[PDB]
Write a protein that binds this DNA or RNA. Structure first.
Ligand SMILES: [Mg+2]
Ligand SMILES: [Zn+2]
Ligand SMILES: [Zn+2]
Lengths: 95, 155, 93, 1099, 293, 147, 129
DNA sequence: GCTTGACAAAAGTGTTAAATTGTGCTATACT
């Protein structure tokens, strides 16, 4: 839009933080040491944060722009632009 | 300030500042100095509320203090403050954050649940808006141009 | 960290030339029979982006896969014909 | 002079050097030879000084031996370090990217006190980097220098600071050790609220002893009178909770705390420097901690003499941390020693613990020893350390001053930001030790300095300066090297004081320096020592400025800095008007080839020079040829000798990059005209004769190194190849079989050097791309094209190629199969925009170069090469540049006396044998005795001809120039002459950058700066201020959105310019979107609200 | 003072509970990237090791809770969990900072925003820009006050998309791809074209540091031989420009508004007097004084 | 003289076995060549020398229609192993033309382009003397050439 | 601190101002600096000699001629418009700010005079010893 | 201008062996 009026701050509640989150990252894992692919449930996990490649799920069963906005029933990755990997947040649920 | 009053401090500060620069051979028209000095006198300390909505010892803008203080049917004193402390008092919270003491600013802003109207020009720079000065002012940017019917005729 | 290029960043000159290439093809295809152009588009998935098998294109025009394979060879030698191909050469890469 | 092949350069010096300049690379070689303790250092310390020399390596090995656990049941002992012959030669290491190193060996003895058995084992510590003849190291193939650091010597230093409130006097003493906690008066370990009396009882001394020892000290009694601590053990408890808060103590822990902190040798490190400092001034002894407090009380009282209760008398006075007596200077050997000590202590930890869990009697010196931390200390010291730097070489002089540099920064010293200007100021004790005139102009001023010419480093780390002792108004030949402490002891006579016959004081009174240092005038009666010569205070580069004494220290500093900034020219002409140092600075640099034995030349080739000694031995020297230097200058060498030539030991066989016939040539001698010329040379700009282009007088070469490797990828192996997926056969036209550019080829910006390819997939080609493939039948290739091309804005000829292949045995890090390096070189003609300068700090860009036809030209028709503006000269106090401009003309045209009948009055003081020099003879005016104003005028008239007997310059150093443009003369006489001007390493080709579109940053989409990245310019905070003051909103918005951060807008704007459409409206800067995300991650809820509808989503 | 905080929570709807975290957000991966450099060796943000300590300790805490554990052990975990989330948000703000190899403290989330290298000053109030260049400057004595010497190589790259269009308009090149190669290889046809696009198309010249707005001024570009920049001798005063080897940046205004602002507001000849004292700046100096004197 | 070709060397920055001067310091020397040619069109000269000695411009064998006017000039000094085989191309023109790179010309990797100075004249000056009232002007010009 | 101060309107119309000294006590002699104080301003009220004739009307630019004219009439002070006394609701007003040092005329309504003031003050700071 | 059958490559699909990965455990005494 490029024209907004106000810009506001406040304390983020745990619920606000949970609503932002596209998933809870449960593992302190970055990427596999062999395949160098993002490890599931870790930081960088494609299930939560997003696809590494445009309209390409982790396993690849749905590789095409034909169906955007569907989730792969196998790897649970959403088919959309890898740009979301820049926009999407996770959360940690503390014990 | 307390002795001779708000308008006299200005005269003093301009003279003093203008003396240092005169010593070194520099020519600055007093108005430039006045623009800066004007920003140190813009607030007043709130001694009593009394029904406000304001808090004692707080520094509030003179205009904002006068209008809401009316409240149809709350006393303060002129306040001198340095340029650094003054700029931190600015209503723009992301303007203050970018200036200095970023963590202090963000924490107080999130507690006060502060809303920034994005009026100032530094705010508009950060977000990529058109600064509200020069050619960015409404009266200029909304100019509408058409050739005179007399001109279109000549083609 | 700030010396790292972004390798997936869009390059403006290519996206524009790709837009221009997408224009020249639309034109060159117009020099082909309605069915000739229609078969090439479906075969390579120009419009949809999803390529199609010879049997699938035969299903839309009501022919055998072999017929489509034939029509494919002809329009390709027509496309390879220099008057059509001369303009697309500089798009090699 | 005194150098066998020295060229003939006449000197105006009226004095005689009593002492040759010492070898000025010595500071590096001595420090290292001490560390390794080779016999060369053995003889040195045996023939004088102490009788038990301990090498640095052995010295740190004594500290380790033995290793004993708490049980003392086993002891691991070290001894006898040994080095093998160097692995590979320096030349081999620089080529193969290895480090020049000798393997080190040690004898490790492990003893079991229970079984009384001994196990002796030879141990390999690691490859220990060695030092080249030139004082450098080769670390992973790159030549590096270890700069010596300035530090505060261990000792007790007192400071008197007036009270910020009461204004009353206070001290305020400090004790700084080698290692361990430091104390201040007892404020300890940064714990305030500590009376100095409470600890004096903590040792067990009863109060009467305080009343006995304190004595005349009133506050000594009042502090114990005010202190409420009763008993020696109770005071240890008030010390225990302040030092170790949180831990309930024990009588075993309360007592050992103080004993272990300082007295114990392990925790508190006595320094040989600290041990020597205070031992004379007054591990740590209880005797020493009492004398501390005693010295203090007898300071604040005002007495100048303290006789210890049982000790010897010394002055009681404040100490100065900036006085060089208290300031070292840890040299390279020591900087290595300390890093070794750290490596061993980290190993001792694994040696101690290893003993416990290792099955006993199965432990050997090896099983307990793991050398990982020892070599890591060395490797991690040379890399990543600020004292270990890539040698600075664009010219021999730059390299020679890099060594000899001393800086106060680095680990073990103050940070650049914190230290105040008191350390940056020159101290009176810097005289003859650290050159005051040479430091950086940046905010390193005074923190970095160069060691003086005759300065010499002490085995303890204090700089010494040579002096000649005077006795009874007679200066002896005795030359004694004194430190700063012993210099404050005596009266240093001025270097030039009139000499009498066989020598003695002539002038009634003597110039002298006191211990202030405060200058004074006393007769010849009271002197002790005299200066060895002028320019003791000066450094090498400073000593190279002709007429230094005429230039303000400001422009002199700039002048020194810029000499080390010059670049070697192809021709390398030596300075027409020089100083002393040019000869000896070039040979000691090492970039010139010197013969080490008298003999004769057997062969002279461009490749090498062999000499047949009178000794019957045969020495040969391989010549560096077009070797690329660290920063890209050219190291090329040329032989100055012929086959038959006789030669003597120490002579100069071949010239280096910046040398001619043995002396440093950093520039060319040019014909200068000081008139302002048609607004072209203005505001420091310079104009040049196109001759300097045509004749390649300012030309210099340059060489760039390009590198690419072929590694193993998860998807395959990278392959260097000539096959590139999409190219015309034209681009490949210069590639050989393997796909690397052919030697002698010409390469433009974007040309291919090494073709390379890497696997790719799965590709998923675009439909529009797959259709063209079918039409033109080019199979989409299996692999992406990642290939080495020449950077934007560069060009030259391909010089050489270096290939390292895994197929060939070679060697390489895991994963790298093939490595190819390509060396490109180019001749750079002097170009408009290049930066030139003289030795006086006068600098400027070339603003124009004119056809030799139209230039100011002398009556001969001789065009001037440079026109320098008159206005920059007078106000800058550099007028020395005008002198050498006159002398330059003298030295070029020759001259005569002045006789007969007699010698004129001015020559009487006096030029000796200087009465006549032919045309083109070279001159030398040592800095602080040079030519003198009177002697210039007398020479200024002399001598014709051009060829015809007419004279081209008057006694004012002026001439009538004819404008080569209109042909008419210039109305007034103009100063002409010859000036020595250097070409400097700021060049237009390197500094010209331009960008339209290019790479963008990963996290922020901004363009990434620097020429390597093809980067854009930074529009900064201050630039936006200027933009706002103008009131240009659309310009400002543009720069900050569609010209940097706007990912859709920047590609649209491009689309618009190429279609000639209107430029579209800007979008949101990506960086701002990032900011919101970073604030969210702090649990700050940041919503962008419209007028409404409330929250907007960035997406 | 204590009222200022307590009062702030009343008027706003903020629950003060927010100051204690049940859940910690995790920043998107591309803002804390992990990527392999040229050669395959990997580099990543410090944030990931910081997030790793937190999640490691939270998971250990779950484990100890389920087994049952003496408070000494469990409380120790919670204390560790607390410190790790501190280091993540603000590192070193309490106690010694979490360090990596070489003992250099890891960069926290707060380290992103703060300082001269933080987002605001580094990436927000300023930034690097397209369509810009720089070189060393040389005297312009023959220039008109509104003009500047522009190195033709520099001009070519700056205007590249403009000429690419022009030489496609004229038939020099048949398609945009050919136009791009024609400019890169610098085939001689482009020069005549460059003069066309550059005509009456202004450019901004800046020299750092920029003290007053006069530190940026628009000029009329003139194609010049050589790699240096020709600067009119009367603007040195405003730029404080020494020819000792100073460099200056060139910026190309694009949009119609930007070009208008250049010609009208920032043009060299319209800014003469200093906007402080009103005294003249472009007035002659140095050589020009003594020449007229 | 425009370009030069030396058998052994493919470029300017190497040495030659036994020769005392590197190829670049030899190109500098060849700069001082003062030649003259009837032209037109390019013509190659030739130089070959073996065994010890000193090479000079006299050792250059010019083709028919060209001449070398300072054979006394030193080129390179050779030793027992030194051999120098180099051909030189003389073109015709005026002024100073910087070396034309063989990427711009049609030359192959072997050719070494060199800066060319075509300037017969060496140093030139003048002066005038009037012809008192009725004064006229008579100028003398001093012209020197390279031979 | 000053970046948000821009000229928002032509006139706030206030009669308030500040008194400039404009020399004194002679001859029996311009103030050393009337160039940075009195010049470029705009008169708040009419400048009147005894008894007197109103030599310059309120709102005058006060150029060089105006100071000479005034000085003749023997006026040893003048009340001047300043941004200190300006009553504008937002920003300041052109009349109160006075002449633009750059243009030499009344400031334009877009001008951001805070930034210009900030820079005019800080730039010479390098010369302040 | 189009279709049929024989046919081989290509592409999936299920079935199995090999490898990779995760977890438990080690009892002189050692705090
Ligand atoms: Mg400068
Ligand atoms: Zn999937
Ligand atoms: Zn107003």
């Amino acid at each position: 839009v490029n024209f907004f009026d106000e810009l506001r701050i406040g304390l983020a509640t745990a619920d606000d933080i949970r609503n932002w989150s596209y998933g809870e990252v449960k593992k302190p894992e970055t990427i596999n040491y062999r395949t160098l692919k993002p490890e599931k449930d870790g930081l960088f996990c494609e299930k939560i944060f997003g696809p590494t490649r445009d309209w390409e799920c982790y396993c690849g069963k749905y590789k095409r722009v034909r169906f955007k906005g569907i989730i792969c029933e196998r790897c649970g990755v959403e088919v959309t632009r890898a740009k979301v990997r820049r926009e999407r947040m996770g959360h940690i649920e503390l014990a | 300030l307390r002795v001779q009053g708000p308008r006299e401090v200005q005269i003093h500060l301009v003279k003093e500042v203008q003396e240092v620069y005169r010593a070194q051979g520099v020519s600055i028209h007093d108005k430039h100095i006045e623009v800066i000095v004007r920003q140190m006198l813009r607030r007043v300390t709130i001694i009593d509320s009394g029904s406000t909505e304001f808090l004692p010892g707080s520094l509030t803008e003179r205009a904002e203090f006068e209008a809401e203080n009316r409240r149809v049917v709350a006393a303060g004193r002129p306040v001198l403050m340095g340029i650094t402390k003054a700029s931190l008092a600015t209503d723009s919270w992301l303007s203050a954050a970018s200036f200095q003491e970023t963590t202090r600013v963000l924490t107080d802003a999130a507690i006060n649940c502060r809303s920034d109207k994005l009026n100032g020009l530094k705010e508009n720079v950060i977000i990529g808006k058109l600064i509200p000065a020069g050619t960015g002012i409404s009266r200029y940017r909304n100019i509408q141009v058409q050739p005179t019917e007399e001109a279109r005729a000549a083609a | 960290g700030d010396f790292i290029e972004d390798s997936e960043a869009v390059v403006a000159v290519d996206a524009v030339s790709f837009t221009l290439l997408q224009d020249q093809l639309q034109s060159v295809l117009e020099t082909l029979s309605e069915r000739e152009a229609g078969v090439v588009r479906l075969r390579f998935g120009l419009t949809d982006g999803q390529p199609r098998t010879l049997d699938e294109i035969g299903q839309v025009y009501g022919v055998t896969r072999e017929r489509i394979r034939q029509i494919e060879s002809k329009t390709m030698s027509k496309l390879r014909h220099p008057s059509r191909s001369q303009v697309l050469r500089d798009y090699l890469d | 002079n005194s150098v066998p092949g020295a060229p003939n350069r006449v000197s105006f010096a009226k004095l005689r050097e009593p002492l040759e300049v010492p070898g000025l690379l010595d500071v590096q070689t001595d420090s290292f030879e001490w560390l390794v303790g080779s016999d060369r250092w053995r003889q040195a310390a045996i023939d004088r000084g102490e009788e038990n020399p301990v090498g640095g390596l052995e010295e740190v090995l004594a500290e380790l031996s033995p290793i004993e656990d708490f049980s003392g049941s086993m002891s691991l002992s070290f001894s006898d370090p040994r080095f093998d012959e160097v692995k590979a030669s320096v030349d081999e290491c620089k080529d193969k990217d290895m480090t020049y190193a000798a393997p080190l060996f040690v004898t490790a003895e492990f003893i079991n006190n229970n079984t009384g058995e001994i196990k002796s084992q030879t141990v390999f510590m690691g490859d220990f980097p060695m030092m080249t003849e030139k004082g450098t190291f080769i670390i992973n193939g790159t030549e590096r220098v270890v700069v010596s650091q300035l530090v505060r010597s261990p000792g007790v230093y007192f400071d008197e600071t007036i009270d910020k409130s009461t204004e009353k006097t206070l001290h305020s003493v400090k004790v700084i050790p080698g290692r361990g906690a430091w104390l201040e008066f007892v404020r300890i370990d940064r714990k305030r609220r500590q009376p100095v009396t409470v600890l004096l009882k903590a040792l067990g001394w009863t109060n009467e002893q305080i009343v006995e020892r304190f004595g005349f000290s009133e506050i000594m009694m009042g502090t114990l009178e005010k202190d409420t601590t009763s008993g020696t053990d109770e005071a240890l408890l008030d010390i225990y909770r302040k030092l170790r808060p949180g831990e309930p103590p024990t009588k075993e822990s309360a007592q050992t705390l103080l004993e272990n902190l300082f007295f114990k040798e392990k925790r508190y490190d006595l320094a040989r420097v600290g041990r020597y400092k205070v031992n004379k001034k007054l591990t740590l002894t209880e005797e020493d901690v009492v004398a501390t407090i005693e010295y203090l009380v007898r300071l604040h009282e005002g007495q100048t003499s303290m006789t210890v209760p049982g000790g010897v008398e010394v002055p009681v006075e404040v100490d100065d941390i900036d006085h060089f007596g208290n300031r070292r200077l840890r040299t390279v050997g020591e900087l290595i020693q300390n890093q070794i000590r750290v490596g061993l202590s980290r190993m001792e930890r694994v040696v101690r613990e290893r003993m416990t869990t290792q099955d006993v009697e199965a432990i050997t010196p090896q099983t307990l020893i793991n050398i990982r931390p020892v070599v890591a200390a060395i490797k991690e010291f040379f890399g990543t350390s600020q004292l270990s730097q890539f040698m600075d070489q664009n010219n021999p002089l730059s390299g020679l001053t890099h060594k000899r540099r001393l800086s106060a920064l680095g680990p073990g010293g103050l940070s650049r930001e914190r230290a105040g200007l008191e350390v940056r100021d020159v101290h009176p004790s810097h005289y003859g030790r650290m050159c005051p005139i040479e430091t950086p102009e940046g905010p390193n001023i005074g923190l970095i300095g160069s060691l003086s010419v005759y300065a010499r480093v002490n085995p303890f780390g204090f700089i010494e300066t040579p002096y000649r002792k005077v006795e009874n108004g007679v200066v002896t030949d005795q030359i004694d090297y004194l430190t700063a402490d012993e210099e404050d002891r005596h009266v240093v006579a001025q270097a030039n004081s009139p000499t009498d016959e066989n020598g003695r004081f002539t002038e009634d009174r003597v110039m002298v320096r006191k211990k202030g240092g405060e200058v004074e005038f006393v007769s010849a009666d009271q002197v002790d020592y005299m200066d060895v010569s002028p320019r003791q205070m000066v450094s090498v580069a400073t000593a190279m400025i002709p007429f230094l004494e005429h230039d303000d220290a400001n422009r002199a500093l700039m002048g020194a800095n810029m000499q080390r900034q010059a670049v070697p020219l192809v021709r390398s002409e030596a300075p027409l008007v020089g100083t002393g140092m040019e000869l000896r600075a070039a040979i000691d640099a090492g970039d010139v080839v010197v013969a080490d034995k008298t003999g004769v030349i057997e062969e002279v080739s461009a490749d090498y020079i062999t000499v047949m000694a009178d000794d019957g031995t045969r020495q040969s020297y391989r010549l560096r040829k077009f070797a690329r230097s660290n920063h890209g200058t050219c190291a090329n060498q040329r032989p100055i000798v012929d086959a038959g030539q006789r030669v003597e030991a120490g002579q100069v066989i071949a010239d280096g990059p910046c040398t001619q016939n043995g002396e440093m040539a950093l520039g060319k001698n040019l014909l200068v005209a000081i008139m302002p010329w048609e607004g072209h040379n203005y505001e420091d700009a310079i104009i040049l004769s196109n001759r300097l282009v045509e004749e390649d007088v300012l030309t210099s070469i340059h060489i760039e190194e390009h590198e690419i490797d072929a590694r193993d990828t998860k998807l395959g192996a990278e392959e260097i190849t000539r096959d590139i997926p999409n190219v015309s056969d034209e681009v490949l036209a210069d590639l050989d079989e393997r796909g690397i550019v052919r030697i002698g080829a010409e390469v433009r910006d974007g040309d291919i050097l090494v073709g390379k390819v890497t696997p790719k997939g799965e590709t998923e080609l675009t439909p529009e791309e797959r259709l063209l493939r079918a039409i033109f039948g080019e199979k989409a290739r299996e692999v992406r094209d990642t290939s080495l091309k020449v950077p934007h804005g560069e060009s030259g000829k391909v010089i050489g190629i270096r290939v390292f292949s895994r197929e060939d045995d070679d060697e390489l890090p895991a994963g790298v199969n093939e490595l190819v390096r390509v060396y490109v070189a180019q001749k750079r003609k002097i170009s408009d925009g290049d930066k030139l300068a003289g030795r006086h700090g006068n600098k400027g860009v070339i603003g124009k170069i004119l056809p030799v036809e139209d230039m100011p030209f002398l009556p001969d028709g001789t065009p001037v090469d440079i026109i320098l503006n008159t206005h920059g000269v007078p106000r800058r106090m550099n007028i020395g540049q005008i002198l050498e401009t006159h002398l330059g003309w003298v030295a070029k045209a020759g001259w005569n006396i002045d006789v007969a009948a007699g010698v004129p009055d001015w020559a009487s003081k006096l030029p000796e044998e200087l009465y006549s020099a032919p045309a083109d003879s070279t001159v030398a005016t040592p800095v602080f005795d040079g030519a003198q104003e009177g002697e210039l005028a007398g020479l200024l008239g002399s001598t014709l001809p051009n060829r015809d007997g007419e004279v081209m310059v008057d006694a004012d150093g002026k001439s009538t120039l004819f404008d080569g443009r209109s042909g008419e003369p210039f109305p007034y006489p103009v100063t002409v002459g010859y000036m020595y001007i250097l070409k400097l390493h700021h060049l237009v080709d390197d500094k010209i950058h331009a960008r339209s579109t290019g790479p963008y940053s990963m996290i922020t989409q901004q363009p990434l700066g620097g020429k390597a990245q093809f980067g854009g310019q930074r529009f900064g905070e201050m630039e936006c201020w200027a933009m706002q003051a103008y009131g240009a909103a659309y310009t400002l918005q543009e720069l900050l959105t569609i010209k940097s951060d706007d990912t859709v807008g920047r590609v649209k704007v491009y689309e618009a310019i190429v279609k000639g459409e209107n430029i579209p409206e800007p979008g949101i800067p990506e960086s701002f979107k990032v900011l919101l995300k970073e604030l969210q991650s702090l649990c700050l809820n940041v919503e962008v609200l419209s007028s409404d509808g409330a929250a907007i989503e960035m997406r | 003072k204590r009222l200022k905080v307590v009062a702030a929570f009343q008027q706003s709807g903020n629950s003060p509970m927010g100051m204690v975290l049940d859940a910690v957000p995790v920043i998107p991966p591309e803002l804390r990237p992990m990527v392999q450099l040229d050669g395959g060796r990997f580099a990543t943000s410090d944030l990931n090791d910081l997030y790793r300590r937190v999640i490691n300790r939270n998971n250990r805490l779950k484990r100890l809770i389920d087994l049952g554990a003496p408070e000494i052990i469990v409380n120790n975990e919670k204390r560790m969990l607390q410190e790790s989330v501190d280091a993540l948000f603000d590192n070193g703000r309490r106690g010694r900072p979490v360090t990596g190899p070489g003992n250099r403290p890891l960069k926290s989330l707060s380290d992103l925003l703060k300082g001269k290298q933080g987002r605001f000053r580094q990436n927000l109030l300023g930034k690097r820009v397209d369509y810009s260049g720089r070189s060393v400057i040389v005297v312009g004595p023959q220039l008109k006050l509104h003009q500047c010497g522009l190195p033709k190589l520099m001009a070519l790259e700056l205007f590249k998309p403009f000429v690419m269009k022009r030489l496609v308009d004229l038939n020099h090149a048949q398609n945009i791809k050919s136009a791009k190669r024609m400019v890169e290889r610098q085939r001689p046809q482009v020069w005549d074209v460059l003069e066309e696009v550059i005509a009456e198309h202004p450019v901004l010249l800046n020299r750092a540091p920029t003290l007053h707005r006069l530190g940026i001024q628009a000029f009329e570009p003139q194609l010049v031989e050589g790699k240096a920049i020709q600067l009119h001798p009367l603007v040195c005063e405003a730029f404080n420009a020494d020819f000792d080897g100073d460099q200056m940046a060139v910026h190309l205004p694009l949009s119609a508004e930007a070009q208008a602002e250049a010609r009208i507001l920032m043009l060299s000849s319209n800014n003469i007097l200093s906007p402080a004292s009103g005294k003249p700046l472009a007035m002659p100096r140095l050589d020009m004084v003594t020449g007229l004197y | 003289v425009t370009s030069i070709r030396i058998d052994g060397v493919l470029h300017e920055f190497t040495t030659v076995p036994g020769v005392k001067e590197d190829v670049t310091d030899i190109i500098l020397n060849l700069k001082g060549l003062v030649v003259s040619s009837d032209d037109d069109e390019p013509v190659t000269m030739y130089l070959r020398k073996q065994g010890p000695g000193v090479v000079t411009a006299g050792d250059i064998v010019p083709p028919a229609g060209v001449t070398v006017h300072n054979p006394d000039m030193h080129i390179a000094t050779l030793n027992d192993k030194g051999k120098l085989e180099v051909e030189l191309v003389v073109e015709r023109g005026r002024g100073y033309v910087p070396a034309v790179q063989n990427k711009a010309s049609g030359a192959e990797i072997g050719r070494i382009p060199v800066d060319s100075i075509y300037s017969p004249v060496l140093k030139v000056t003048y002066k005038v003397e009037a012809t008192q009232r009725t004064d006229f002007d008579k100028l003398i010009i001093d012209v020197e050439t390279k031979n | 601190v000053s970046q948000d101060v821009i000229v928002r309107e032509h006139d706030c119309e206030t009669e308030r101002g500040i008194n400039v000294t404009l020399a004194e006590r002679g001859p029996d002699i311009r103030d050393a600096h009337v160039e940075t104080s009195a010049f470029a301003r705009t008169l708040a009220t009419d400048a009147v000699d005894a008894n007197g004739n109103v030599i310059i009307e309120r709102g005058h630019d006060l150029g060089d001629p105006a100071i000479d004219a005034l000085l003749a009439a023997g006026i040893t002070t003048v009340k001047v418009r300043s941004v200190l006394t300006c009553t504008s609701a937002t920003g300041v007003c052109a009349m109160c700010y006075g002449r633009s040092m750059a243009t030499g005329k009344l400031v334009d309504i877009g001008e951001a005079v805070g930034i210009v003031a900030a820079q005019s003050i800080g730039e010479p700071g390098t010369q302040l010893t």
